[PDB]
Amino acid sequence: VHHVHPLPDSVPESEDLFAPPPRMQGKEGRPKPHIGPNYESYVKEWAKTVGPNSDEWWAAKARETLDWYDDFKTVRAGGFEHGDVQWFPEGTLNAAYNCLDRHYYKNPKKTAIIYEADEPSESREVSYEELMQETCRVANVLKSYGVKKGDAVSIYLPMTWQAAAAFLACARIGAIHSAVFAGFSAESLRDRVNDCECKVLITTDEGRRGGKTIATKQIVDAALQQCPLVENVLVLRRTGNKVPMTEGRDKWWDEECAKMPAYCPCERMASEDPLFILYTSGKPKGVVHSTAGYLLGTALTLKYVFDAHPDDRFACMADIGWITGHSYIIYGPLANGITTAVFESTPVYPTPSRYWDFVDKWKATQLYTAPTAIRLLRRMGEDHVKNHDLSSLRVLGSVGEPINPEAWHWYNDFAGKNQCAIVDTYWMTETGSISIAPLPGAISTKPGSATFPFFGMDVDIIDPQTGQVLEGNDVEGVLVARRPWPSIARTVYRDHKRYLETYMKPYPGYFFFGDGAARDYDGYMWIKGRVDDVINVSGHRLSTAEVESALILHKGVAETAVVGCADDLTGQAVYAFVTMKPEFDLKATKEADLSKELAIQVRKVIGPFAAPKKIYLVSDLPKTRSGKIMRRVLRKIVAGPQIVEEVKQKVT
Ligand SMILES: CCCOP(=O)(O)OC[C@H]1O[C@@H](n2cnc3c(N)ncnc32)[C@H](O)[C@@H]1O
Numbered sequence: 001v002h003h004v005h006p007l008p009d010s011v012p013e014s015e016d017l018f019a020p021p022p023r024m025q026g027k028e029g030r031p032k033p034h035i036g037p038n039y040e041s042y043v044k045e046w047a048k049t050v051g052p053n054s055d056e057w058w059a060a061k062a063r064e065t066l067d068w069y070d071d072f073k074t075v076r077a078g079g080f081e082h083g084d085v086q087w088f089p090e091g092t093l094n095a096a097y098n099c100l101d102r103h104y105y106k107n108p109k110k111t112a113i114i115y116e117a118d119e120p121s122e123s124r125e126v127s128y129e130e131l132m133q134e135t136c137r138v139a140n141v142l143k144s145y146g147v148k149k150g151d152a153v154s155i156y157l158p159m160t161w162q163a164a165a166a167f168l169a170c171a172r173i174g175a176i177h178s179a180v181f182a183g184f185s186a187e188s189l190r191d192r193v194n195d196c197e198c199k200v201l202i203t204t205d206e207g208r209r210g211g212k213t214i215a216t217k218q219i220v221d222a223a224l225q226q227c228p229l230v231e232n233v234l235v236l237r238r239t240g241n242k243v244p245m246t247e248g249r250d251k252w253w254d255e256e257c258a259k260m261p262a263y264c265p266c267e268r269m270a271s272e273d274p275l276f277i278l279y280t281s282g283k284p285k286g287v288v289h290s291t292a293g294y295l296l297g298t299a300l301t302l303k304y305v306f307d308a309h310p311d312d313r314f315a316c317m318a319d320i321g322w323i324t325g326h327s328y329i330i331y332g333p334l335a336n337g338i339t340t341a342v343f344e345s346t347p348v349y350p351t352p353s354r355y356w357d358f359v360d361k362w363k364a365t366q367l368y369t370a371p372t373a374i375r376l377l378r379r380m381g382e383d384h385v386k387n388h389d390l391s392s393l394r395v396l397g398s399v400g401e402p403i404n405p406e407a408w409h410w411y412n413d414f415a416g417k418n419q420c421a422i423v424d425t426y427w428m429t430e431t432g433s434i435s436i437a438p439l440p441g442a443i444s445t446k447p448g449s450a451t452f453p454f455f456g457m458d459v460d461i462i463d464p465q466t467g468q469v470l471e472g473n474d475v476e477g478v479l480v481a482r483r484p485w486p487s488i489a490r491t492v493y494r495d496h497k498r499y500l501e502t503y504m505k506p507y508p509g510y511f512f513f514g515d516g517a518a519r520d521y522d523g524y525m526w527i528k529g530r531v532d533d534v535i536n537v538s539g540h541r542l543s544t545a546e547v548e549s550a551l552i553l554h555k556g557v558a559e560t561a562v563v564g565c566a567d568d569l570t571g572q573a574v575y576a577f578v579t580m581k582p583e584f585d586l587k588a589t590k591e592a593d594l595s596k597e598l599a600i601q602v603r604k605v606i607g608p609f610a611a612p613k614k615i616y617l618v619s620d621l622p623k624t625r626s627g628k629i630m631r632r633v634l635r636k637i638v639a640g641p642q643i644v645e646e647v648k649q650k651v652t
Pocket of ligand 1: 425
């Protein structure tokens with residue numbers, strides 16, 4: 001029938017298509033969608049945003065969405081080949097003016113940040129007025145340290161609301177902020193501090209996350225032992241517990257800010273001035289974004305992928321150390337002038353009901369999280385969500401990895417009660433903003449499909465064995481883009497050759513995401529996993545999401561990862577690392593029978609070749625702080641944080 005199949009699901013294809021629900025049709029007093037009600041309404045608007053006549057739309061959106069000090073004249077220029085991408089180059093603006101000042105001038109008492117503290121009872125709303133005053137104070141403090149336009153400033157802050165003020169204070173004066181996930185080791189912090197050559201660092205005395213203390217200042221003290229360029233450290237008093245402070249070098253955030261005025265002017269920034277550096281986990285890649293294209297891209301995707309409306313309370317549960325936090329906690333939502341959540345805790349603290357307690361307390365209208373969090377709460381059962389309201393939500397988003405249809409259905413049935421649109425949002429740090437996602441008022445969804453590309457995104461499928469584009473539908477290969485879009489990364493910091501070689505060289509003429517992808521018979525796009533994770537069994541090229549979505553169809557399975565290994569008879573062979581739910585009786589099911597049933601399930605939905613050669617039952621998989629599964633690690637172990645010793649021990 002079809003060359004390309006959906007990710008394995010227990011639900012039949014003919015009953016697995018989800019039209020926008022009533023909460024996304026302008027019924028029950030909910031806002032009418034910006035784009036709707038159907039696929040044709042998405043195509044009609046999307047077509048204006050790509051092709052040789054798309055400048056007019058982008059020019060209008062740029063002028064309508066952002067406040068400019070100087071207008072631009074050129075809409076776009078440059079290209080992939082040399083990495084000289086330009087958007088609105090003659091224009092000037094300020095990101096902090098667009099995220100704070102203009103909204104403060106309209107409604108200063110409107111809530112900018114819902115600060116959901118690690119302890120629920122310490123939460124509160126932070127108005128645009130308060131956020132802007134604190135941003136301006138910090139901006140004044142940085143100027144007193146001699147920080148100039150174009151200087152780098154490192155940020156090592158946990159998920160307290162002042163992290164937005166630190167970002168936006170750097171943006172306000174034209175400094176380039178480099179945020180580092182709070183909790184990274186002293187060595188990882190040091191490597192990123194030295195690479196951006198910053199002279200100022202911002203951090204807390206301590207962090208709080210899940211009832212546990214992050215010793216940020218002690219970590220900072222170990223790191224700066226090898227960072228000779230850092231002269232000033234601004235220390236936010238988050239807990240007030242005793243930490244070491246170095247005379248002269250270190251200062252308390254509150255005592256410095258109390259000396260400064262509560263307003264600070266905005267540096268007028270060129271469209272292409274660098275806004276930030278964001279390192280991704282070879283050596284750390286300093287991904288650089290400029291100002292206007294990135295801001296416009298986060299503003300537009302937030303408005304259209306989540307159907308944001310003025311009074312919305314947008315809840316992105318990620319961390320600001322991640323691009324997801326950059327684009328859909330701070331810049332995107334604050335640019336649109338709505339309320340945004342800064343969530344300091346974990347999904348299971350104090351109990352696995354926290355997400356849903358949070359939604360009903362604040363009456364959030366959109367929730368945006370990661371598959372790893374969705375599969376975690378699935379592992380915990382349905383009683384932490386069944387007895388909540390959750391009816392203020394209209395849209396639920398998933399980001400970071402392919403979402404298995406099992407998880408997609410749990411999300412849809414319990415978080416949304418079958419009344420929310422599910423937006424599977426595909427993008428990368430290097431894309432700046434969401435690349436492929438359903439528009440929730442228009443697109444009928446399929447579990448595990450990102451569906452259709454966003455405005456400005458013209459994507460295609462290349463057969464990696466020929467280097468040539470595959471025309472039509474029902475094709476599979478590697479995902480590429482044909483043209484720059486406004487928010488694409490502009491370089492890798494002081495390493496432009498790595499930028500060109502990684503993204504622009506593999507398929508000359510295109511941008512190479514690094515993900516395997518398929519376009520099915522309806523034109524829906526499926527992102528199936530990293531190209532490096534593809535497993536080649538006797539010609540059959542298997543993707544990680546494919547096999548993992550099959551394995552999770554078996555009862556008792558909480559999460560899985562599969563990697564390839566050298567096999568003489570099949571080229572490569574599939575090896576599966578399976579995580580079971582805690583209450584699964586492993587003594588009653590003889591493990592060899594479990595592994596046998598798992599092979600049968602994979603052979604049924606995928607084919608005989610896809611059955612794992614070996615299956616390792618483990619307690620947890622190696623994962624990053626954002627929740628990406630570390631298949632490279634498992635692949636290396638099967639070929640010769642504490643969860644890494646368990647994997648090596650179970651494989652020997
Ligand atoms: C955007 C937040 C994550 O940014 P990062 O730069 O950390 O990682 C990007 C990678 O995450 C995966 N990825 C992310 N989102 C999806 C997604 N929605 N579906 C399938 N794969 C995904 C894709 O493999 C991609 O190359």
